């Protein structure tokens, strides 16, 4: 058994260093060369608000079992995660660190770390996935409070106490830190916007949401108050162990791919708990995507088993908006869900409509008689008002997934509508720019239709199609329909 | 492992 300061980092990282000529990003989608240059206990800046430094905690806060699942992690990053926990946490609050090695190619990545004080290693004999692995770690846990971390994190100053203090006060709170960013290229540790929290669109993939004006006003008035959130962000949360068990742990029929925070966030909120972000708790994390998952695309299928298991149990009739967004999922097998249905019945949970109204009212729900909804996409761009009002041109702009000027519907009256403005064919000559004008129910100039498997938008009663070829020249136009890239448009939801 | 995720940002202009 070795105390973490005596652990031989250079021998552990060892023969796994990147050779010259090898892709530094190959092991786990971040730059391993730079990860390997850091020490295991490298200093990081204290990104907490100044008020957080004036907080004191009882010595009798409940200890936690920290459960870290991993699969083919970069050794330097896995070791720095473990050391961060040990270095930054009051030792008495760390009952144990349980590493659950989810069938990594080399079992030494984990086994060598089991020499460290407090570190226990459980190795799965096949790839089970994060959710099943977390259940294994949780069943093995000795403490009364579970802490789940991912395998490429770095805990900051007094990260743990604020989380435990919330759960010790009310066992129904499931709580997370603010996630700071560890850059995937250069490994610098920095803070992100304080006005971002976890969310999702009807495709049910995680996204960052920008707080509304009310929420931002509220945050300004106390930047260290706990923040309620509709969806856990990241790999990271603390939960009373008995509450985790009572609520149904994780669904053990989930597989490797996607959905890790979806089912649990719905279940916690619907079945009477809550999700919080705790600003005085900071943990940095290496995010590995540069862009959102593309939809349409293959991800909708890759994530469908786990996503359907969430939607079919929890979402009631709202699952239909998910299938509107991800029609490729509609027929993907997802296994029997009777026991999870039984759990929901046993726990007396609220309907999804209640979740939408009380927990996530910012998720906008299509009108009952909308034909299509969401954003109107063309490649990675979206139909956009460019901030214009009546008589202004419309445009196209990089899809930002933030709603706003990119929020549209195709209404029962066949209009393409944003707030009370509608796309209007003010001039039928081919080439002419279209304009935003007030929606009027019987204006033939404002009628559009999806054509060709919902891949274009034609002006009803015409051979004119919406066309971005004029976007450099002033905005979108009507153009003679033809086989042009600039005439491809598709709503994210087809109802 | 976790499901790879985007770095925390949003649109850089306002609605
Ligand atoms: C920000 O403004 C630009 C135009 O300058 C776009 O309209 C973009 O869609 C806007 N962002 C949001 C969130 O509506």
Residue numbers in the entry:
A (entry chain A): 75 to 569
B (entry chain P): 1 to 15
Quote the passages of the study that discuss this structure, keeping the authors' original sentences:
In metazoans, this post-translational modification is initiated by a large family (20 in humans) of polypeptide N-acetylgalactosaminyltransferases (GalNAc-Ts), which transfer a GalNAc residue from uridine diphosphate N-acetylgalactosamine (UDP-GalNAc) to Ser/Thr side chains in the presence of manganese. GalNAc-T isoforms contain an N-terminal catalytic domain adopting a GT-A fold and a unique C-terminal lectin domain, classified as a carbohydrate-binding module (CBM) 13 in the CAZy database, with a β-trefoil fold that are connected through a short flexible linker. Here we present the first crystal structures of the inactivated and activated forms of the GalNAc-T2 isoform in binary and ternary complexes with different GalNAc-glycopeptides enabling us to study in detail the lectin-mediated modulatory mechanism of catalysis.
Interestingly, MUC5AC-13 was bound to an active form of GalNAc-T2, whereas MUC5AC-Cys13 and MUC5AC-3-13 were unpredictably trapped bound to the inactive form of GalNAc-T2. In these cases, the flexible loop was found in an open conformation, different from the one previously described for the GalNAc-T2-UDP complex (PDB entry 2FFV14 and root-mean-square deviation (RMSD) of 4.68 Å for aligned Cα atoms corresponding to the flexible loop; Fig. 1c,d), which further demonstrates the loop versatility. MUC5AC-13 as well as MUC5AC-Cys13 and MUC5AC-3-13 glycopeptides have a C-terminal GalNAc moiety that establishes interactions with the lectin domain-binding site. The sugar moiety for the three above glycopeptides adopts a perpendicular conformation with respect to the peptide backbone. This also supports previous data suggesting that Cys residues bound to a GalNAc moiety mimic fairly well Thr residues linked to the same sugar. Although the N-terminal of MUC5AC-13 is covered by the flexible loop, the N-termini of MUC5AC-Cys13 and MUC5AC-3-13 are exposed to the solvent and inserted into the sugar nucleotide-binding site. The latter two glycopeptides adopt very similar binding modes, although some differences stand out towards the N-terminus (RMSD of 0.72 Å for aligned Cα atoms corresponding to residues Gly1-Ser5).
